[PDB]
Amino acid sequence: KDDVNYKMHFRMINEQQVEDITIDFFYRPHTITLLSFTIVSLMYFAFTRDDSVPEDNIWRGILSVIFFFLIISVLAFPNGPFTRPHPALWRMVFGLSVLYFLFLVFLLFLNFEQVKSLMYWLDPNLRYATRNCHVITWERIISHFDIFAFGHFWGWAMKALLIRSYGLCWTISITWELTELFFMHLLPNFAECWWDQVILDILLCNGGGIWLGMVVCRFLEMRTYHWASFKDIHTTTGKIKRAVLQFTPASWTYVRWFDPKSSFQRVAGVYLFMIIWQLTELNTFFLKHIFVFQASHPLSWGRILFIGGITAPTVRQYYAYLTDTQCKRVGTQCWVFGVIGFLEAIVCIKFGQDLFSKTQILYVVLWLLCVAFTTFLCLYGMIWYAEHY
Amino acid sequence: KDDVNYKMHFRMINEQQVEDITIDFFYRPHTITLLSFTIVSLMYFAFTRDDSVPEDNIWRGILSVIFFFLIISVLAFPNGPFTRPHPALWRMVFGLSVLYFLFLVFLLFLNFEQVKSLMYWLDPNLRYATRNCHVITWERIISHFDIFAFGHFWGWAMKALLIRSYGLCWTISITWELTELFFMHLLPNFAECWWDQVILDILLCNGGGIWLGMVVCRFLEMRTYHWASFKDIHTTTGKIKRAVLQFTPASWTYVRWFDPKSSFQRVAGVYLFMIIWQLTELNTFFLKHIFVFQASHPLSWGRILFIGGITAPTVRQYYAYLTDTQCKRVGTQCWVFGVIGFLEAIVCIKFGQDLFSKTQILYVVLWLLCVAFTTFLCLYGMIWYAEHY
Numbered sequence A, B: 001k002d003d004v005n006y007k008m009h010f011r012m013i014n015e016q017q018v019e020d021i022t023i024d025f026f027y028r029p030h031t032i033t034l035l036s037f038t039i040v041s042l043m044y045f046a047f048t049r050d051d052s053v054p055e056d057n058i059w060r061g062i063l064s065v066i067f068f069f070l071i072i073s074v075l076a077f078p079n080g081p082f083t084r085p086h087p088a089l090w091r092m093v094f095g096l097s098v099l100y101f102l103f104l105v106f107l108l109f110l111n112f113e114q115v116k117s118l119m120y121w122l123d124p125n126l127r128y129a130t131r132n133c134h135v136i137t138w139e140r141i142i143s144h145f146d147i148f149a150f151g152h153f154w155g156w157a158m159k160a161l162l163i164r165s166y167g168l169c170w171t172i173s174i175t176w177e178l179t180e181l182f183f184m185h186l187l188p189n190f191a192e193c194w195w196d197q198v199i200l201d202i203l204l205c206n207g208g209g210i211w212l213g214m215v216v217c218r219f220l221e222m223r224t225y226h227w228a229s230f231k232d233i234h235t236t237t238g239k240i241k242r243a244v245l246q247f248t249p250a251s252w253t254y255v256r257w258f259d260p261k262s263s264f265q266r267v268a269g270v271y272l273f274m275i276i277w278q279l280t281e282l283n284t285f286f287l288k289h290i291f292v293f294q295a296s297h298p299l300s301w302g303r304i305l306f307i308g309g310i311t312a313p314t315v316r317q318y319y320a321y322l323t324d325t326q327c328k329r330v331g332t333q334c335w336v337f338g339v340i341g342f343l344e345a346i347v348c349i350k351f352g353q354d355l356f357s358k359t360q361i362l363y364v365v366l367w368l369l370c371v372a373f374t375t376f377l378c379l380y381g382m383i384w385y386a387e388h389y
């Protein structure tokens, strides 16, 4: 009856259960109350709204379809490896990921003019958007740390927290920064400098974020998780502390990617993990350059903020499927993350037939082959340093 | 730890498990194989299709979104009370129901011209569709049994099979046929006769379908379900019989709606069941009359064929939630069925402001009140006949 253990491990990694429930009204379902709310809200909107403007009806209908799909997600979609701060938030994150996957599926069938029209419908200002370090100055160097460098620091902090490896994080950091420098040489869009991508991105933002993530990860590993109930706390300070720590992990998994005597499927799964990581880093660059929008546009940072949100559970589910011998099935969030990464790659290839010439396409392919080979060399070096030191 | 029993009963009525699996390759998941298939098919379509015609791109993208949402349904959506012939078919039925619910949500925000344009886009021929029994003849009476009378017979057979009650079925049959006769008097659209709805619909089609459904239900109750494996059958005839009986119920539930000493929530839940039944019968009539399409159009019989498909699990889940004391949550298919019924009612009210005048609206409201009162009287009479005879 090992199939019992297999399906229970799949439910452990796919729909985690809330343990030691003390305040029971956060976890008792009220789906008939939700049905009445749904029907009454849709009734109020149907019978009171003004449906005279035909382009507002479409926008409101889209927003309402998204909202009630999130409701359906809360009701029916899987929860993931996380139960904190509430499993319903992760059900809604999964529903958003499914919506994005279906949006990419639909996008793969239009032509470029239809996609540009679909974009100008969202932000009409996107119609007019278009695509020196010899005078070195400390002021201009320090002026590089904008809000996006802050976001990049924190994204690398989250990545290092989840991955728990200096080697993988630094490998991906250096390889992607060099790839981006190469692409900015191939495309005249570059404006900042060499030194930015060489020092102020690898060493300071990415490196510091990785350091912070690894420190916080070691802290969360070495600590004891004794959760008292909010009802049992008698001080107000303890109540506020418990309510704010409800937004932190209840427990922490010990993550080791390479064992001393590792198999071949293990190293191959780690290599595929690093390759999909590089691919998701390429998707951002190429979506930004194909459909011309800036980094400050809600498309850019919205997609970048959603990809990290769905990256958090995906790493845990991938690590479980890779290492846990009894997890005989891939989590559904990891499945959707993989399909979203590959569909974004296909979208960039389909509508990206204008970016490069044939010689530039040759150079891009040769560089991507060299990057895959260098990633493999770094992975082998990590395996060797592990199984010897 | 009664919450364990509560959630296990919810999983019994919401995601039923396949028992005694002998041919294991119909039930082992292959979601990475499905991921590779998804990506390769979408890649082949993206890189080979002709995206020159802009109105074919939208149609193909819609169809592909539906297909891959059905894939996501197979992966993530609940199964229902049924595991026969395969739980994935019922996951896909649930996904279609979710799609229809979201379509109604979207429809509630457009105006009437936008809905008519959305319809003429589907079937351009819908632009030109527009809204004697004193010479009695046996030939004209027998000529009434078209393919739709056949479908109605079989729909009532399925309803009687699931409900397991002559009283409820005959009550709904007579009340709805009288309501439809009243509405066809209020609307000059009538063409057939009095005698059709009085004799050839209540007595022959509905009555005969109910009789057949009750006979088949008693048969399925009194029989023993010994399922041998397809591998263990040694004759070819037995193999074909097992393969064709894989499309029949594996077991049958004994259904009794009224106990001798029933509560008030029990009778109230049965009354609500009958009222939602009447409402779903009204939705068909009014969708057909608001948006003018014939009964032979794929909209009419397609929606009528999908509503029965999702009616099959909904009745079982409603009966479980009503009668089973440990089923502390409503099944998700029953939830979606209820929201679809009420949303179709809201859609008919929103776009149906043209069908009736104010006096006709008064007559419709008075008739619906009388119908609710007569349904309650019939339910009380059934309760009395049960608790006395």
Ligand SMILES: CCCCCCCC/C=C/CCCCCCCC(=O)O[C@H](COC(=O)CCCCCCCCCCCCCCC)COP(=O)([O-])OCC[N+](C)(C)C
Residues within 6 Å of the ligand: A159, A265, A266, A268, A269, A270, A271, A272, A273, A275, A276, A277, A280, A311, A314, A315, A318, A320, A321, A322, A323, A324, A325, A326, A327, A328, A329, A330, A334, A335, A337, A338, A339, A365, A368, A369, A372, B032, B035
């Ligand atoms: C033109 C340019 C040219 C460029 C050329 C480039 C060429 C480079 C090409 C490289 C191709 C390399 C192929 C190697 C494949 C071998 C894999 C393997 O066997 O390991 C297996 C698992 O492997 C898996 O887990 C697969 C699951 C993945 C599906 C989800 C995707 C989501 C990813 C999310 C990533 C998120 C990252 C985001 C981080 C921010 C190991 O497991 P097992 O031992 O087999 O046993 C099964 C598991 N149990 C039983 C133990 C439980």
Ligand SMILES: CCCCCCCC/C=C/CCCCCCCC(=O)O[C@H](COC(=O)CCCCCCCCCCCCCCC)COP(=O)([O-])OCC[N+](C)(C)C
Residues within 6 Å of the ligand: A032, A035, B159, B265, B266, B268, B269, B270, B271, B272, B273, B275, B276, B277, B280, B311, B314, B315, B318, B320, B321, B322, B323, B324, B325, B326, B327, B328, B329, B330, B334, B335, B337, B338, B339, B365, B368, B369, B372
């Ligand atoms: C203008 C014209 C005017 C007209 C006026 C008209 C006015 C008429 C208005 C009539 C309104 C009557 C209201 C009566 C409500 C009382 C209900 C009650 O208490 O019973 C309760 C359940 O009740 C429920 O189950 C509710 C769940 C329903 C939600 C899903 C909808 C899907 C329906 C699918 C129908 C499919 C049919 C399709 C068939 C083909 C009983 O249960 P409980 O004892 O409370 O305990 C809970 C359950 N446990 C604990 C035992 C497990």
Ligand SMILES: [Ca+2]
Residues within 6 Å of the ligand: A177, A180, A197, A201
């Ligand atoms: Ca950079």
Ligand SMILES: [Ca+2]
Residues within 6 Å of the ligand: B177, B180, B197, B201
């Ligand atoms: Ca009729």
